């Protein structure tokens, strides 16, 4: 089963961002290298579309850091509370 | 976990065509960049799931 | 922060406009010279926004908001359903020496060692009353300010009133805290729930009757059965007394008695029933039933023992 379109657009926008940030430092041989980069990006998207992988479910990746931090805080609070309860 | 070997061998199946030094350097740079991004994303996903299930287990235990 | 300001705004919006000045005067948080600056003749929303501006200009913590909530709740005290508790102590224990600070510290520490995030606010008021507002929480969540719990305690007495809001999951914890802080041994729940706190206070302390004795027209109409009328009047006066009755609004009975009346003679199983009495002012409608001719002259003991037995919920078996 092919993956959902959300991760596909995520990957394509990261590719666009990295292409832009590597082109920002380019001075010579401008248009042909970016045309080749776009061609290989499209080829990679096609290859990912044709590939198969067992499905997985999640949400957008823009909220990873906040969720991880709150999970760490919850883990620490639960651990200290459990330690206090066990000592009691 | 299965698309990773494919994307890994994409490197040397692309190396056989390009020959310019600057293009090769750029290819290697963004290849290692996207590889690091993929690895960190997968690790973050796995540890996020583990932290979620661990938090559920601990809250059940304390309650 | 913004949560404190939002909570204060919600509390102020809940407060009526006519009695708002009294509530702010009783709160005694903002300076007096900052009160006349706000004009109360304008719209309510403008006044609320202005008060939010003034309280945000000054450093306001959550304790002030909790105290304001306590003041508002004790001024209204009719928006929640109250339950009572009874506390028992061993015969070998001497009379305790009650202290405010020790009780406060013990009550705070019990919850602080039981849970992790919990808010406690105290208010000591006249006739020896202690109001406790508790905002619940756990290790993995912040304290919730939307579902508080109110407790009223009377010093050196075995009774304590509670508000039935969210304590159903932490009722044993609250009971343990109360019985530990006040140095008691057992706590039980009485079958008495009502919305009027004053009626519960009068019934529990049995001070509702204060009648004390000390030395310090159309003759053409003939009313027959007059002796029956005077007899039922005397019986009603003797049973229900003459003092003003306390105000109640609900009563519940559960019955598991057999049916005895040819009809269901062979049945050996009880007839399960549930009966509810509801009225805006109970114990006064029942007083007028016998004169109206709806009920017999002596009422059943199940209806004339509500204040004497101090119960509201009854269970009856065969």
From Swiss-Prot, chain A:
It is found in: Nucleus; Chromosome, Centromere. This is Centromere protein Q. Component of the CENPA-CAD complex, composed of CENPI, CENPK, CENPL, CENPO, CENPP, CENPQ, CENPR and CENPS. The CENPA-CAD complex interacts with the CENPA-NAC complex, at least composed of CENPA, CENPC, CENPH, CENPM, CENPN, CENPT and CENPU. The chain holds residues 74 to 161 of 268 of the full protein. It comes from the Eukaryota. Component of the CENPA-CAD (nucleosome distal) complex, a complex recruited to centromeres which is involved in assembly of kinetochore proteins, mitotic progression and chromosome segregation. May be involved in incorporation of newly synthesized CENPA into centromeres via its interaction with the CENPA-NAC complex. Plays an important role in chromosome congression and in the recruitment of CENP-O complex (which comprises CENPO, CENPP, CENPQ and CENPU), CENPE and PLK1 to the kinetochores. The lineage of its organism: Eukaryota, Metazoa, Chordata, Craniata, Vertebrata. Belongs to the CENP-Q/OKP1 family.
Swiss-Prot record, chain B:
Expressed at high levels in the testis, fetal liver, thymus, bone marrow and at lower levels in the lymph nodes, placenta, colon and spleen. Present in all cell lines examined, including B-cells, T-cells, epithelial cells and fibroblast cells. Expressed at high levels in glioblastoma cell lines. It comes from the Eukaryota. A motif (Nuclear localization signal) lies at residues 52-63. It is found in: Cytoplasm; Nucleus; Chromosome, Centromere, Kinetochore. Component of the CENPA-NAC complex, at least composed of CENPA, CENPC, CENPH, CENPM, CENPN, CENPT and CENPU. The CENPA-NAC complex interacts with the CENPA-CAD complex, composed of CENPI, CENPK, CENPL, CENPO, CENPP, CENPQ, CENPR and CENPS. Interacts with MLF1. Interacts with PLK1. (Microbial infection) Interacts with the N-terminal domain of Kaposi's sarcoma-associated herpesvirus latent nuclear antigen (LNA). Belongs to the CENP-U/AME1 family. Component of the CENPA-NAC (nucleosome-associated) complex, a complex that plays a central role in assembly of kinetochore proteins, mitotic progression and chromosome segregation. The CENPA-NAC complex recruits the CENPA-CAD (nucleosome distal) complex and may be involved in incorporation of newly synthesized CENPA into centromeres. Plays an important role in the correct PLK1 localization to the mitotic kinetochores. A scaffold protein responsible for the initial recruitment and maintenance of the kinetochore PLK1 population until its degradation. Involved in transcriptional repression. This is Centromere protein U. It comes from Homo sapiens (Human).
UniProtKB/Swiss-Prot annotation, chain C:
Belongs to the CENP-N/CHL4 family. The gene is CENPN. The modification Phosphoserine is found at residues 219, 262. One of its GO terms (cellular component) is inner kinetochore. Component of the CENPA-NAC complex, at least composed of CENPA, CENPC, CENPH, CENPM, CENPN, CENPT and CENPU. The CENPA-NAC complex interacts with the CENPA-CAD complex, composed of CENPI, CENPK, CENPL, CENPO, CENPP, CENPQ, CENPR and CENPS. Interacts directly with CENPA. Identified in a centromere complex containing histones H2A, H2B and H4, and at least CENPA, CENPB, CENPC, CENPT, CENPN, HJURP, SUPT16H, SSRP1 and RSF1. Changing residue 195 to A: Decreases the binding to centromeres. Component of the CENPA-NAC (nucleosome-associated) complex, a complex that plays a central role in assembly of kinetochore proteins, mitotic progression and chromosome segregation. The CENPA-NAC complex recruits the CENPA-CAD (nucleosome distal) complex and may be involved in incorporation of newly synthesized CENPA into centromeres. CENPN is the first protein to bind specifically to CENPA nucleosomes and the direct binding of CENPA nucleosomes by CENPN is required for centromere assembly. Required for chromosome congression and efficiently align the chromosomes on a metaphase plate. One of its GO terms (biological process) is chromosome segregation. It is found in: Nucleus; Chromosome, Centromere, Kinetochore. Its main location: nucleus. The keyword Glycoprotein does not apply. It comes from the Eukaryota. This is Centromere protein N. Keywords: Centromere, Chromosome, Kinetochore, Nucleus, Phosphoprotein. It holds the Pfam family CENP-N.
């Amino acid at each position: 089963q092919p993956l959902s379109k959300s991760t596909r657009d995520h990957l394509q926008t990261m590719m666009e961002s990295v292409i832009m940030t590597i082109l920002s430092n380019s001075i010579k041989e401008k248009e042909e290298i970016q045309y080749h980069l776009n061609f290989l990006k499209k080829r990679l998207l096609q290859q990912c579309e044709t590939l198969k992988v067992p499905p997985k479910k999640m949400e957008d990746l823009t909220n990873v850091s906040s969720l991880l931090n709150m999970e760490r805080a919850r883990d620490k609070a639960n651990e200290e509370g459990l330690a206090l309860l066990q000592e009691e | 976990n299965i698309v990773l070997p494919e994307f890994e061998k994409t490197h040397l199946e692309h190396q056989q065509r390009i020959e310019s030094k600057v293009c090769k350097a750029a290819i290697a740079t963004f290849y290692v960049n996207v590889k690091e991004q993929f690895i960190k994303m997968l690790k973050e996903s796995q540890m996020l799931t583990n932290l979620k299930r661990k938090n559920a287990k601990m809250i059940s235990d304390i309650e | 922060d913004e949560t404190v300001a939002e909570f204060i705004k919600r509390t102020i919006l809940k407060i009526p406009m006519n009695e708002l000045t009294t509530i702010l005067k009783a709160w005694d948080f903002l300076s007096e010279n900052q009160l006349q600056t706000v004009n109360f003749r304008q719209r309510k929303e403008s006044v609320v926004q202005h008060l939010i501006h003034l309280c945000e200009e000054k450093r306001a913590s959550i304790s002030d908001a909790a105290l304001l909530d306590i003041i508002y709740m004790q001024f209204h005290q009719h928006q929640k359903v109250w339950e009572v508790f009874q506390m028992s102590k061993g015969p070998g224990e001497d009379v305790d020496l009650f202290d405010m600070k020790q009780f406060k510290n013990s009550f705070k520490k019990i919850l602080q060692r039981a849970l992790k995030n919990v808010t406690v606010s105290f208010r000591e008021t006249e006739e020896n009353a202690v109001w406790i507002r508790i905002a619940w929480g756990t290790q993995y969540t912040k304290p919730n300010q939307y579902k508080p719990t109110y407790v009223v305690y009377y010093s050196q007495t075995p009774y304590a009133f509670t508000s039935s809001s969210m304590l159903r999951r932490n009722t044993p914890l609250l009971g343990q805290a109360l019985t530990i802080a006040s140095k008691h041994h057992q706590i039980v729940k009485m079958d008495l729930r009502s919305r009027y706190l004053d009626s519960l206070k009068a019934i529990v302390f049995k001070q509702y009757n204060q009648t004390f004795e000390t030395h310090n027209m159309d003759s053409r109409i003939i009313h027959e059965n007059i002796v029956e009328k005077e007899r039922v009047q005397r019986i009603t006066q003797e049973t229900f007394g003459d003092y003003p009755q306390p105000q109640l609004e609900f009563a519940q009975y559960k019955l598991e008695t057999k049916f005895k009346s040819s009809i269901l003679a062979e049945r050996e199983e009880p007839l399960r029933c549930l009966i509810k009495f509801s009225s805006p002012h109970l114990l006064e409608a029942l007083k007028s039933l016998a004169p109206a001719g709806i009920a017999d002259a002596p009422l059943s003991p199940l209806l004339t023992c509500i204040p004497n037995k101090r119960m509201n919920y009854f269970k009856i078996r065969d």
